[PDB]
């Protein structure tokens, strides 16, 4: 529709960073060592970053396209396309503030 005519770059506030994210990463876990599935609250969680295959939740209650825009009430995973996993961000809440090294060195 609309065409891109300009690109702007600026600083990001803490309040803007929290509006980007779909959840907070609380654990350093990647995946289960036996089932090879992402762990809850980890760096690959489906409830934050989206489903791994199209229109399929973690628990398996939903498996088809008809429930588009729906969130499972059991696993908490949105039923949508798996390509959102390239675009959805998370965030980490620090216990104490830290400086950005670009604006220091």
């Amino acid at each position: 529709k609309k065409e891109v005519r300009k690109v702007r770059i600026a600083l990001a506030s803490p309040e803007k960073i929290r509006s980007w994210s779909y959840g907070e990463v609380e654990k350093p876990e990647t995946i289960n060592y036996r089932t090879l599935k992402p762990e809850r609250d980890g760096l690959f969680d489906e409830r934050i970053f989206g489903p791994i295959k199209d229109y399929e939740c973690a628990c398996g209650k939903y498996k088809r396209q008809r429930f588009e825009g729906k969130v499972c009430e059991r696993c908490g995973v949105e039923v949508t396309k798996s390509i959102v996993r390239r675009y959805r961000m998370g965030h980490i809440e620090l216990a104490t503030p830290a400086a950005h090294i670009w604006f220091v060195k």
Partner: protein, 1114 residues
């Protein structure tokens, strides 16, 4: 076919063993066969005695002796099962309790040491490897001038690599002599006080110079006690740590006096004694005993520095690129260095184990864990820069690989930070390092070759032989000397005329410290052995080298390594004389051990009964695949009942003909332009070469597949593959493997395999399709191995390894592995690369039928046409002289040996051409034929060009043209002669490894990358071509906006665009408009991870969403 030899110089010694740099160094390190009590303190024996004994500080672990066991598997078994050819190592240790006095001895297993093959290589994980020698600066004491300020010098002390820090001694402008250690500069008097030096001692010896000694006479620290000075020095070295004497003496003693930490080296100690004129007891800077430090080298180094600055006649600066200051580390030393590294780690785990856990009940075996030692050795032989994949395209390739010298590697220089001076040809390179053989590009001058007569001595310095000259007569006594020793004499050239042993010339060309001079015979002290000692083995194989420019001689010697073996390979018509020794030392052929009689001859083995009565059977390697894919086999050359002498040839190896190196063919060459098919190095050949199987070679390719255990189920190698017709499964046997002898083409199945399908419900459209035809979906899918595009041939071998087989170490989860070998026979074709020994190369551009080729008046056509425009600007005239001599041999039926710089000259070549004309033309007259009408026309022009003498008869003028290497040549297309006489002769041409069959590739669509979603790279991956920045600039300068946009979006990473473009074309439509590339979306996300807000706007500054709303929180 007889052989004629030229030359005058008589060599007094033959060439040394050409692989002795590898073989002799690794034997000295191992000392495998020397009895333990007679072993000398070198190699790994010296490493055992350096780390041991290990003391807790009351438990002592000591070393007694070691031994090496027999290898577990033979060499051919290791190659087939991907093993390492090695031997177990055992150490005999004893534990002593100091408090009690009880001793226990046992033998502990330490691991495996790789073993070197007879030709000088290793088998690491089933692959052949070569350890390349390293050159580096020798340790010692050196004096160089100050670049910033004239009249000042710097003294350096350099240990072995990673065996101590460098020490600098400089006179500061203020007059204080300073010592710099680890980027920290402190006055020398502080440390010189620690060595118990007083004010009366220093001024006695160094006070004979002037103002310099005054800078060493500070009274602030002179009265200070050595213990107080020791602590003060410790604070400067590492400030912050608590000053304690127990910690202070540990740091100072461990920095310059601990033999386990500082090592000057045998070469470094020898250099220091020669220069400073002292004698060293050890290999450290200072010696610690009786609770005090005693000086060993610091005082003599300081005296040389002061006297050099003062200007005494006997002291001079050092040249760091002088070959007397550079030394070679061979395979034995490089291996032993890592053996000592891993042994120090083992002693570190022994100490932590003997002070914690069952101290009263200990055994030597329970203390020792050999895992650190095996990891050090394994890392060296696998992931070292000096351990390289062996080059074995032909036997000459592997010989050169073993004589290469590299300045790179761990502890060496870097490719990017190396300057001009380190890359130059130094004057001391003469007779030690070849001046012409080196790679062009970023590695020029950093990788070199050993000279043919050179050898590395025990300390690592290269020596070259010279003949002693006394009183004007030359003796046969030969002395090997280094560059530093060579500088003291006047050395005559090898071509100096002699009357027996007496020098005959009044004026002699000689060198004095590297520069040419003219001297009298009574001033000569040494003489060169032969011209061959200046160059390497590759350069010594080029005849008429004296007529070639060095820039083109570099190409010729390098490209002999890339020649592939031929099924009808033959030895060159013109040889230098090194062809026999190259085949002999490569160990590729088979020779008789002593006199005997041949009993059995076969294509697989030969049996010889020797005169002592014993029978020896020799198996033959047949159709073996090398690291580069070329076939290596041995062909017998004897018959049953034939008597043989000691050293007689039994079987030819690859690229050899009756014991001579054979890298190509001998062809008939004409030098003339031909219709533009010779344009800019292109080459025209005849179809007659293909008809008689010239330039035909055999290549073998290997393919592999695995059957694994998965969660869904195990993969199975089977013939029953779903949805496949009988035409596809015709050549597979009952086990799913292709039968031996089958002919395979791209798309043909080699091994059949099935895998369990992942759980995924099908798409609705497929579900209706399966309902219509009444077909039930299967639970497995096709995952078989097929021939890649552009490949194929004949199946000649299969190998099947299964879990549990003896010697087979498969990775966890792998059930079995199947390997298939495919062989093809390659004939010469358009696009193949050819070369000669003088640096002339080019690709084949045209193949002509025989009736199209130019031919001699007797009907003989030529084989190859070369453009004369490639000669003049390259200045490689050796190929012209080889052609002239090959023309004489074509009619006389003989071959020649012309050594380099002493060989065939034009008067001798013209005397041979006169004899060849008598059979080339005297034959015609007897048969009843005169002079052709067409030859009279060419002769008429030839005297207008000033080529023949006016007034002579036609027969006399044809002979005048023959002595210049020219003949009258007819055109095959018209039958009329070329208007001028053409140079025609015989030349030796090689077929190189680079063939167009292995290089042609194309792609429409294929695999894509994970993160950027762009096409992969490389033909092996079926990847696309890189369209880089400079290519984008060219499209911008053309104004092709739409062509540039397609490559950026529709053909690389616009996922939606590339799907729509493919569907439009198969429907007969024009491709649609592209969209945002995916790599730009990645850049925006990666910038957001850096807490930067990047936003795309429109004309009104309103935001534009490029993520389709997929990343917006509702």
């Amino acid at each position: 076919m007889e052989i004629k030899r030229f030359g005058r110089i008589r060599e007094v010694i033959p060439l040394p063993p050409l692989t002795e740099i590898q073989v002799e160094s690794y034997r000295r390190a191992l000392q495998a066969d020397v009895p333990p009590e007679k072993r000398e303190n070198v190699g790994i024996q010296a490493a055992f005695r350096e780390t041991f004994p290990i003391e807790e500080e009351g438990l002592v672990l000591d070393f007694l002796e070691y031994r090496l066991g027999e290898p577990p598997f033979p060499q051919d078994e290791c190659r087939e099962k991907d093993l390492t050819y090695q031997a177990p190592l055992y150490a005999r240790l004893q534990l002593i309790h100091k408090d009690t006095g009880l001793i226990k001895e046992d033998e502990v297993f330490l691991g495996h040491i790789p073993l070197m093959t007879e030709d000088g290589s290793f088998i690491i994980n089933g692959a052949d490897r070569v350890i390349v020698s390293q050159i580096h600066r020798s340790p010692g004491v050196y004096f160089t001038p100050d670049p910033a300020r004239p009249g000042r010098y710097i003294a350096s002390i350099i240990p072995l690599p990673k065996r101590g820090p460098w020490i600098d001694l400089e006179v500061e402008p203020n007059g204080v002599v300073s010592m710099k250690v680890n980027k920290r500069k402190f006055p020398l008097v502080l440390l010189l006080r620690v060595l118990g030096y007083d004010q009366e001692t220093l001024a006695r010896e160094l006070g004979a110079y002037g103002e310099l000694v005054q800078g060493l006479m500070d009274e602030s620290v002179f009265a200070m006690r050595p213990e107080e000075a020791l602590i003060r020095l410790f604070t400067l070295l590492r400030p912050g740590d608590p000053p304690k004497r127990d910690k202070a003496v540990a740091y100072v003693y461990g920095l310059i006096a601990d033999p386990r930490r500082y090592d000057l080296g045998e070469a470094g100690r020898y250099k220091a004694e020669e220069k400073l004129g002292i004698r060293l007891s050890g290999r450290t800077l200072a010696r610690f005993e009786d609770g005090e430090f005693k000086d060993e080298v610091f005082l003599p180094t300081l005296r040389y520095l002061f006297a050099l600055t003062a200007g005494v006649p006997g002291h001079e600066v050092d040249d760091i690129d002088h070959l007397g200051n550079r030394r070679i580390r061979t395979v034995g030393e490089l291996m032993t260095d890592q053996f000592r590294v891993g042994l120090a780690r083992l002693a570190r785990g022994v100490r932590e184990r003997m002070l914690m856990g069952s101290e009263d009940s200990l055994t030597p075996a329970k203390l020792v864990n050999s895992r650190p030692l095996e990891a050090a050795i394994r890392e060296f032989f696998s992931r070292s820069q000096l351990s390289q994949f062996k080059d074995e395209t032909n036997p000459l390739s592997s010989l050169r690989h073993k004589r290469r010298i590299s300045a790179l590697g761990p502890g060496g220089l870097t490719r990017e930070r190396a300057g001009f001076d380190v890359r130059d040809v130094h004057r001391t390179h003469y007779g030690r390092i070849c001046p012409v053989e080196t790679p062009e590009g970023a590695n020029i001058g950093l990788i070199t070759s050993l000279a043919a007569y050179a050898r590395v001595d025990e300390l690592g310095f290269i020596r070259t032989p010279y003949r002693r000259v006394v009183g004007g007569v030359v003796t046969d006594e030969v002395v090997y000397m280094t560059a530093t020793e060579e500088d003291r004499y006047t050395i005559a050239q090898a071509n100096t005329p002699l009357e027996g042993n007496r020098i005959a010339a009044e004026r002699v060309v000689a060198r004095r410290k590297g520069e040419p001079v003219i001297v009298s015979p009574e001033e000569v002290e040494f003489m060169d052995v032969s011209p061959k000692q200046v160059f390497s083995v590759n350069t010594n194989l080029i005849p008429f080298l004296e007529h070639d420019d060095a820039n083109r001689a570099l190409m010729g010697s390098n490209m002999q390594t890339q020649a592939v073996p031929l099924i009808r390979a033959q030895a060159p018509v013109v040889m230098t004389g090194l062809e026999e020794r190259v085949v002999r030392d490569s160990l590729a052929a088979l020779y008789a051990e002593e006199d005997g009689e041949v009993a059995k001859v076969d294509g697989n083995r030969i049996v010889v009964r020797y005169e002592d009565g014993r029978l020896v059977e020799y198996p033959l390697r047949r159709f073996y695949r090398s690291n580069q894919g070329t076939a290596l086999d041995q062909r017998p050359r004897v018959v049953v009942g034939q008597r043989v002498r000691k050293g007689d040839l039994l079987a030819d190896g690859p690229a050899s003909e009756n014991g001579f190196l054979a890298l190509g063919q001998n062809v008939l060459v004409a030098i003339m332009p031909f219709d533009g098919y010779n344009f800019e190095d292109a080459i025209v050949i005849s179809e007659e070469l293909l008809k008689r199987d010239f330039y035909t070679s055999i290549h073998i390719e290997r393919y592999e597949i695995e059957a694994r255990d998965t969660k869904l189920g195990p993969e199975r190698i089977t013939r029953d593959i779903p949805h496949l017709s009988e035409a596809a499964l015709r050549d597979l046997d009952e086990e799913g493997v292709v039968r031996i002898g089958a002919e395979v083409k791209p798309g043909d199945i080699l091994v059949g395999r099935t895998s369990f399908k992942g759980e995924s419900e099908p798409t609705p459209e497929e579900r209706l399709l399966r309902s219509i035809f009444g077909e039930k979906a299967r639970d497995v899918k096709d995952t078989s191995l097929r021939v890649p595009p552009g490949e194929g041939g004949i199946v000649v071998r299969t190998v099947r390894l299964r879990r549990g087989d003896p010697g087979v170490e498969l990775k966890p989860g792998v059930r079995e592995v199947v390997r298939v070998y495919v062989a093809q026979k390659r004939k010469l074709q358009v696009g193949d690369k050819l070369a000669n020994r003088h640096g002339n190369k080019g690709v084949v551009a045209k193949i002509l039928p025989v009736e199209d080729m130019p031919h001699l008046p007797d009907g003989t056509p030529v084989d190859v046409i070369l453009n004369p425009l490639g000669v003049p600007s390259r200045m490689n005239l050796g190929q012209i002289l080889e052609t002239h001599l090959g023309l004489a041999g074509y009619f006389l039926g003989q071959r020649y040996i012309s050594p380099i710089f002493d060989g065939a000259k034009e008067p001798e070549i013209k005397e041979l051409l006169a004899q060849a004309f008598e059979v080339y033309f005297g034959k015609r007259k007897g048969e009843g034929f005169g002079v052709d009408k067409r030859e009279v026309e060419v002769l008429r022009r030839a005297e207008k060009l000033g080529l023949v003498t006016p007034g002579k008869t036609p027969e006399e003028q044809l002979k005048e043209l023959f002595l210049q290497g020219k003949v009258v040549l007819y055109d095959g297309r018209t039958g009329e002669p070329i208007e001028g006489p053409i140079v025609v002769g015989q030349m030796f041409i090689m077929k190189l490894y680079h063939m167009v069959e292995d290089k042609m590739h194309a792609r429409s669509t294929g695999p894509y990358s994970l993160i950027t979603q762009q096409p992969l790279g490389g033909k092996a991956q079926f990847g696309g071509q890189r369209f880089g920045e400079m290519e984008v600039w060219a499209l911008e300068a053309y104004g092709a906006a739409h062509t540039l946009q397609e490559m950026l979006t529709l053909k690389s990473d616009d996922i939606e665009g590339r799907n729509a473009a493919y569907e439009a074309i198969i429907k007969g439509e024009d491709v649609p408009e592209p969209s945002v590339p995916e790599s730009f979306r990645v850049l925006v996300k990666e910038l957001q991870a850096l807490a930067l807000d990047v936003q795309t706007l429109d004309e009104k500054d309103n935001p534009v969403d490029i993520f389709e709303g997929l990343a917006s929180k509702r």
